[PDB]
């Protein structure tokens, strides 16, 4: 393409460079996702 | 259904380690306590972003150490119904 700087202009958005799948369904799934974490994240006898 | 529901801590980024160490430290002191997922994760999210590179890099460094430890066990790990 001919856009050397032009394709960069919009990347002033809050990004991490976009290398990570960002959860859109919940913010409590942002860091510690339940699937793996529940083994250690919490130690409960049952729901 | 990859599963692997018995993995180690993980290769999680420093971001999750921030929540990880904080949520755990509280749970270690208080075995009677837990946290609210939506609450604690949001508080950590906002707080993390506003921290300095020194602090973020600290969690990043710890993550690197756990990542390598993960790799070590990863080789000796057999995926249960790991499709």
mmCIF file with all atom_site columns, C-alpha atoms in Angstrom:
data_model
loop_
_atom_site.group_PDB
_atom_site.id
_atom_site.type_symbol
_atom_site.label_atom_id
_atom_site.label_alt_id
_atom_site.label_comp_id
_atom_site.label_asym_id
_atom_site.label_entity_id
_atom_site.label_seq_id
_atom_site.pdbx_PDB_ins_code
_atom_site.Cartn_x
_atom_site.Cartn_y
_atom_site.Cartn_z
_atom_site.occupancy
_atom_site.B_iso_or_equiv
_atom_site.pdbx_formal_charge
_atom_site.auth_seq_id
_atom_site.auth_comp_id
_atom_site.auth_asym_id
_atom_site.auth_atom_id
_atom_site.pdbx_PDB_model_num
ATOM 1   C CA . UNK A 1 1  ? 0.000   0.000   0.000  1.00 0.00 ? 1  UNK A CA 1
ATOM 2   C CA . UNK A 1 2  ? 0.969   3.668   -0.168 1.00 0.00 ? 2  UNK A CA 1
ATOM 3   C CA . UNK A 1 3  ? -0.152  4.424   3.379  1.00 0.00 ? 3  UNK A CA 1
ATOM 4   C CA . UNK A 1 4  ? 3.008   4.499   5.476  1.00 0.00 ? 4  UNK A CA 1
ATOM 5   C CA . UNK A 1 5  ? 1.757   6.802   8.216  1.00 0.00 ? 5  UNK A CA 1
ATOM 6   C CA . UNK A 1 6  ? -1.941  6.851   7.276  1.00 0.00 ? 6  UNK A CA 1
ATOM 7   C CA . UNK A 1 7  ? -2.655  3.313   8.490  1.00 0.00 ? 7  UNK A CA 1
ATOM 8   C CA . UNK A 1 8  ? -1.159  4.284   11.859 1.00 0.00 ? 8  UNK A CA 1
ATOM 9   C CA . UNK A 1 9  ? -3.325  7.369   12.387 1.00 0.00 ? 9  UNK A CA 1
ATOM 10  C CA . UNK A 1 10 ? -6.276  5.511   13.899 1.00 0.00 ? 10 UNK A CA 1
ATOM 11  C CA . UNK A 1 11 ? -4.115  3.500   16.307 1.00 0.00 ? 11 UNK A CA 1
ATOM 12  C CA . UNK A 1 12 ? -4.292  6.301   18.853 1.00 0.00 ? 12 UNK A CA 1
ATOM 13  C CA . UNK A 1 13 ? -7.033  4.227   20.448 1.00 0.00 ? 13 UNK A CA 1
ATOM 14  C CA . UNK A 1 14 ? -6.501  2.517   23.836 1.00 0.00 ? 14 UNK A CA 1
ATOM 15  C CA . UNK A 1 15 ? -4.743  -0.641  22.675 1.00 0.00 ? 15 UNK A CA 1
ATOM 16  C CA . UNK A 1 16 ? -1.965  -2.958  23.804 1.00 0.00 ? 16 UNK A CA 1
ATOM 17  C CA . UNK A 1 17 ? -1.028  -3.237  20.104 1.00 0.00 ? 17 UNK A CA 1
ATOM 18  C CA . UNK A 1 18 ? -3.884  -5.745  19.955 1.00 0.00 ? 18 UNK A CA 1
ATOM 19  C CA . UNK A 1 19 ? -2.115  -9.052  20.526 1.00 0.00 ? 19 UNK A CA 1
ATOM 20  C CA . UNK A 1 20 ? -4.584  -10.387 23.065 1.00 0.00 ? 20 UNK A CA 1
ATOM 21  C CA . UNK A 1 21 ? -8.215  -11.564 22.731 1.00 0.00 ? 21 UNK A CA 1
ATOM 22  C CA . UNK A 1 22 ? -10.209 -9.073  24.792 1.00 0.00 ? 22 UNK A CA 1
ATOM 23  C CA . UNK A 1 23 ? -13.350 -10.514 26.468 1.00 0.00 ? 23 UNK A CA 1
ATOM 24  C CA . UNK A 1 24 ? -16.409 -8.567  25.379 1.00 0.00 ? 24 UNK A CA 1
ATOM 25  C CA . UNK A 1 25 ? -19.000 -10.472 27.400 1.00 0.00 ? 25 UNK A CA 1
ATOM 26  C CA . UNK A 1 26 ? -17.634 -9.730  30.890 1.00 0.00 ? 26 UNK A CA 1
ATOM 27  C CA . UNK A 1 27 ? -14.979 -7.598  32.587 1.00 0.00 ? 27 UNK A CA 1
ATOM 28  C CA . UNK A 1 28 ? -14.606 -10.164 35.365 1.00 0.00 ? 28 UNK A CA 1
ATOM 29  C CA . UNK A 1 29 ? -13.200 -12.499 32.721 1.00 0.00 ? 29 UNK A CA 1
ATOM 30  C CA . UNK A 1 30 ? -10.588 -9.901  31.774 1.00 0.00 ? 30 UNK A CA 1
ATOM 31  C CA . UNK A 1 31 ? -7.650  -11.298 33.751 1.00 0.00 ? 31 UNK A CA 1
ATOM 32  C CA . UNK A 1 32 ? -8.411  -14.534 35.524 1.00 0.00 ? 32 UNK A CA 1
ATOM 33  C CA . UNK A 1 33 ? -10.698 -16.538 33.249 1.00 0.00 ? 33 UNK A CA 1
ATOM 34  C CA . UNK A 1 34 ? -12.882 -19.012 35.222 1.00 0.00 ? 34 UNK A CA 1
ATOM 35  C CA . UNK A 1 35 ? -12.083 -22.131 33.164 1.00 0.00 ? 35 UNK A CA 1
ATOM 36  C CA . UNK A 1 36 ? -8.531  -22.479 34.475 1.00 0.00 ? 36 UNK A CA 1
ATOM 37  C CA . UNK A 1 37 ? -8.453  -20.270 37.553 1.00 0.00 ? 37 UNK A CA 1
ATOM 38  C CA . UNK A 1 38 ? -11.206 -21.857 39.625 1.00 0.00 ? 38 UNK A CA 1
ATOM 39  C CA . UNK A 1 39 ? -8.792  -24.578 40.757 1.00 0.00 ? 39 UNK A CA 1
ATOM 40  C CA . UNK A 1 40 ? -6.764  -22.040 42.741 1.00 0.00 ? 40 UNK A CA 1
ATOM 41  C CA . UNK A 1 41 ? -8.565  -18.681 42.457 1.00 0.00 ? 41 UNK A CA 1
ATOM 42  C CA . UNK A 1 42 ? -11.090 -19.895 45.027 1.00 0.00 ? 42 UNK A CA 1
ATOM 43  C CA . UNK A 1 43 ? -11.344 -22.943 47.290 1.00 0.00 ? 43 UNK A CA 1
ATOM 44  C CA . UNK A 1 44 ? -15.002 -23.693 47.906 1.00 0.00 ? 44 UNK A CA 1
ATOM 45  C CA . UNK A 1 45 ? -16.849 -26.844 49.065 1.00 0.00 ? 45 UNK A CA 1
ATOM 46  C CA . UNK A 1 46 ? -19.482 -26.255 46.419 1.00 0.00 ? 46 UNK A CA 1
ATOM 47  C CA . UNK A 1 47 ? -21.683 -23.603 44.734 1.00 0.00 ? 47 UNK A CA 1
ATOM 48  C CA . UNK B 2 1  ? -13.066 -29.733 23.706 1.00 0.00 ? 1  UNK B CA 1
ATOM 49  C CA . UNK B 2 2  ? -9.351  -29.264 24.329 1.00 0.00 ? 2  UNK B CA 1
ATOM 50  C CA . UNK B 2 3  ? -10.012 -29.013 28.037 1.00 0.00 ? 3  UNK B CA 1
ATOM 51  C CA . UNK B 2 4  ? -6.746  -29.490 29.924 1.00 0.00 ? 4  UNK B CA 1
ATOM 52  C CA . UNK B 2 5  ? -8.681  -28.464 33.086 1.00 0.00 ? 5  UNK B CA 1
ATOM 53  C CA . UNK B 2 6  ? -5.811  -29.364 35.409 1.00 0.00 ? 6  UNK B CA 1
ATOM 54  C CA . UNK B 2 7  ? -3.122  -27.017 34.104 1.00 0.00 ? 7  UNK B CA 1
ATOM 55  C CA . UNK B 2 8  ? -0.602  -25.187 36.344 1.00 0.00 ? 8  UNK B CA 1
ATOM 56  C CA . UNK B 2 9  ? -0.912  -21.448 37.089 1.00 0.00 ? 9  UNK B CA 1
ATOM 57  C CA . UNK B 2 10 ? -0.550  -20.702 33.408 1.00 0.00 ? 10 UNK B CA 1
ATOM 58  C CA . UNK B 2 11 ? 1.356   -18.463 31.015 1.00 0.00 ? 11 UNK B CA 1
ATOM 59  C CA . UNK B 2 12 ? -0.959  -15.594 31.885 1.00 0.00 ? 12 UNK B CA 1
ATOM 60  C CA . UNK B 2 13 ? 0.273   -12.080 31.215 1.00 0.00 ? 13 UNK B CA 1
ATOM 61  C CA . UNK B 2 14 ? 1.416   -9.754  34.016 1.00 0.00 ? 14 UNK B CA 1
ATOM 62  C CA . UNK B 2 15 ? -2.101  -8.313  33.985 1.00 0.00 ? 15 UNK B CA 1
ATOM 63  C CA . UNK B 2 16 ? -3.605  -11.538 35.339 1.00 0.00 ? 16 UNK B CA 1
ATOM 64  C CA . UNK B 2 17 ? -0.694  -12.019 37.736 1.00 0.00 ? 17 UNK B CA 1
ATOM 65  C CA . UNK B 2 18 ? -1.625  -8.665  39.249 1.00 0.00 ? 18 UNK B CA 1
ATOM 66  C CA . UNK B 2 19 ? -5.087  -10.022 40.059 1.00 0.00 ? 19 UNK B CA 1
ATOM 67  C CA . UNK B 2 20 ? -3.617  -13.436 40.825 1.00 0.00 ? 20 UNK B CA 1
ATOM 68  C CA . UNK B 2 21 ? -1.184  -12.429 43.555 1.00 0.00 ? 21 UNK B CA 1
ATOM 69  C CA . UNK B 2 22 ? -3.604  -9.925  45.116 1.00 0.00 ? 22 UNK B CA 1
ATOM 70  C CA . UNK B 2 23 ? -6.682  -12.174 45.156 1.00 0.00 ? 23 UNK B CA 1
ATOM 71  C CA . UNK B 2 24 ? -4.546  -14.996 46.497 1.00 0.00 ? 24 UNK B CA 1
ATOM 72  C CA . UNK B 2 25 ? -2.789  -13.016 49.214 1.00 0.00 ? 25 UNK B CA 1
ATOM 73  C CA . UNK B 2 26 ? -6.223  -12.096 50.591 1.00 0.00 ? 26 UNK B CA 1
ATOM 74  C CA . UNK B 2 27 ? -7.401  -15.710 50.357 1.00 0.00 ? 27 UNK B CA 1
ATOM 75  C CA . UNK B 2 28 ? -4.290  -17.010 52.128 1.00 0.00 ? 28 UNK B CA 1
ATOM 76  C CA . UNK B 2 29 ? -4.776  -14.662 55.085 1.00 0.00 ? 29 UNK B CA 1
ATOM 77  C CA . UNK B 2 30 ? -8.509  -15.331 55.071 1.00 0.00 ? 30 UNK B CA 1
ATOM 78  C CA . UNK B 2 31 ? -9.346  -18.964 54.224 1.00 0.00 ? 31 UNK B CA 1
ATOM 79  C CA . UNK B 2 32 ? -12.877 -18.038 55.272 1.00 0.00 ? 32 UNK B CA 1
ATOM 80  C CA . UNK B 2 33 ? -13.061 -15.413 52.545 1.00 0.00 ? 33 UNK B CA 1
ATOM 81  C CA . UNK B 2 34 ? -13.401 -15.177 48.817 1.00 0.00 ? 34 UNK B CA 1
ATOM 82  C CA . UNK B 2 35 ? -13.862 -12.233 46.464 1.00 0.00 ? 35 UNK B CA 1
ATOM 83  C CA . UNK B 2 36 ? -16.479 -10.955 44.047 1.00 0.00 ? 36 UNK B CA 1
ATOM 84  C CA . UNK B 2 37 ? -15.383 -11.692 40.475 1.00 0.00 ? 37 UNK B CA 1
ATOM 85  C CA . UNK B 2 38 ? -16.943 -8.632  38.829 1.00 0.00 ? 38 UNK B CA 1
ATOM 86  C CA . UNK B 2 39 ? -15.853 -6.365  41.677 1.00 0.00 ? 39 UNK B CA 1
ATOM 87  C CA . UNK B 2 40 ? -12.266 -7.429  42.247 1.00 0.00 ? 40 UNK B CA 1
ATOM 88  C CA . UNK B 2 41 ? -11.446 -7.872  38.560 1.00 0.00 ? 41 UNK B CA 1
ATOM 89  C CA . UNK B 2 42 ? -12.761 -4.398  37.706 1.00 0.00 ? 42 UNK B CA 1
ATOM 90  C CA . UNK B 2 43 ? -10.872 -2.731  40.560 1.00 0.00 ? 43 UNK B CA 1
ATOM 91  C CA . UNK B 2 44 ? -7.679  -4.470  39.471 1.00 0.00 ? 44 UNK B CA 1
ATOM 92  C CA . UNK B 2 45 ? -8.295  -3.599  35.821 1.00 0.00 ? 45 UNK B CA 1
ATOM 93  C CA . UNK B 2 46 ? -8.538  0.141   36.435 1.00 0.00 ? 46 UNK B CA 1
ATOM 94  C CA . UNK B 2 47 ? -5.802  0.174   39.077 1.00 0.00 ? 47 UNK B CA 1
ATOM 95  C CA . UNK B 2 48 ? -3.345  -1.783  36.913 1.00 0.00 ? 48 UNK B CA 1
ATOM 96  C CA . UNK B 2 49 ? -3.680  0.564   33.950 1.00 0.00 ? 49 UNK B CA 1
ATOM 97  C CA . UNK B 2 50 ? -2.887  3.576   36.120 1.00 0.00 ? 50 UNK B CA 1
ATOM 98  C CA . UNK B 2 51 ? 0.325   2.042   37.536 1.00 0.00 ? 51 UNK B CA 1
ATOM 99  C CA . UNK B 2 52 ? 3.875   2.740   36.370 1.00 0.00 ? 52 UNK B CA 1
ATOM 100 C CA . UNK B 2 53 ? 6.092   0.610   34.117 1.00 0.00 ? 53 UNK B CA 1
ATOM 101 C CA . UNK B 2 54 ? 8.244   -0.291  37.129 1.00 0.00 ? 54 UNK B CA 1
ATOM 102 C CA . UNK B 2 55 ? 5.258   -1.906  38.832 1.00 0.00 ? 55 UNK B CA 1
ATOM 103 C CA . UNK B 2 56 ? 3.860   -3.494  35.674 1.00 0.00 ? 56 UNK B CA 1
ATOM 104 C CA . UNK B 2 57 ? 7.301   -4.830  34.784 1.00 0.00 ? 57 UNK B CA 1
ATOM 105 C CA . UNK B 2 58 ? 7.522   -6.312  38.268 1.00 0.00 ? 58 UNK B CA 1
ATOM 106 C CA . UNK B 2 59 ? 4.431   -8.424  37.601 1.00 0.00 ? 59 UNK B CA 1
ATOM 107 C CA . UNK B 2 60 ? 5.738   -9.120  34.103 1.00 0.00 ? 60 UNK B CA 1
ATOM 108 C CA . UNK B 2 61 ? 9.005   -10.423 35.534 1.00 0.00 ? 61 UNK B CA 1
ATOM 109 C CA . UNK B 2 62 ? 7.172   -12.708 37.956 1.00 0.00 ? 62 UNK B CA 1
ATOM 110 C CA . UNK B 2 63 ? 5.048   -13.931 35.056 1.00 0.00 ? 63 UNK B CA 1
ATOM 111 C CA . UNK B 2 64 ? 8.214   -14.796 33.114 1.00 0.00 ? 64 UNK B CA 1
ATOM 112 C CA . UNK B 2 65 ? 9.371   -16.961 36.016 1.00 0.00 ? 65 UNK B CA 1
ATOM 113 C CA . UNK B 2 66 ? 6.022   -18.751 36.242 1.00 0.00 ? 66 UNK B CA 1
ATOM 114 C CA . UNK B 2 67 ? 5.861   -19.077 32.448 1.00 0.00 ? 67 UNK B CA 1
ATOM 115 C CA . UNK B 2 68 ? 9.154   -20.988 32.435 1.00 0.00 ? 68 UNK B CA 1
ATOM 116 C CA . UNK B 2 69 ? 8.009   -23.150 35.341 1.00 0.00 ? 69 UNK B CA 1
ATOM 117 C CA . UNK B 2 70 ? 4.834   -23.805 33.385 1.00 0.00 ? 70 UNK B CA 1
ATOM 118 C CA . UNK B 2 71 ? 6.862   -24.864 30.345 1.00 0.00 ? 71 UNK B CA 1
ATOM 119 C CA . UNK B 2 72 ? 8.761   -27.320 32.507 1.00 0.00 ? 72 UNK B CA 1
ATOM 120 C CA . UNK B 2 73 ? 5.598   -29.069 33.662 1.00 0.00 ? 73 UNK B CA 1
ATOM 121 C CA . UNK B 2 74 ? 3.911   -28.549 30.285 1.00 0.00 ? 74 UNK B CA 1
ATOM 122 C CA . UNK B 2 75 ? 6.267   -31.115 28.765 1.00 0.00 ? 75 UNK B CA 1
ATOM 123 C CA . UNK B 2 76 ? 5.369   -33.630 31.470 1.00 0.00 ? 76 UNK B CA 1
ATOM 124 C CA . UNK B 2 77 ? 1.688   -32.807 31.134 1.00 0.00 ? 77 UNK B CA 1
ATOM 125 C CA . UNK B 2 78 ? -0.666  -35.102 29.253 1.00 0.00 ? 78 UNK B CA 1
ATOM 126 C CA . UNK B 2 79 ? -3.881  -33.420 27.985 1.00 0.00 ? 79 UNK B CA 1
ATOM 127 C CA . UNK B 2 80 ? -6.971  -35.150 29.467 1.00 0.00 ? 80 UNK B CA 1
ATOM 128 C CA . UNK B 2 81 ? -9.259  -35.623 26.459 1.00 0.00 ? 81 UNK B CA 1
ATOM 129 C CA . UNK B 2 82 ? -7.043  -33.034 24.801 1.00 0.00 ? 82 UNK B CA 1
ATOM 130 C CA . UNK B 2 83 ? -8.560  -32.956 21.336 1.00 0.00 ? 83 UNK B CA 1
#
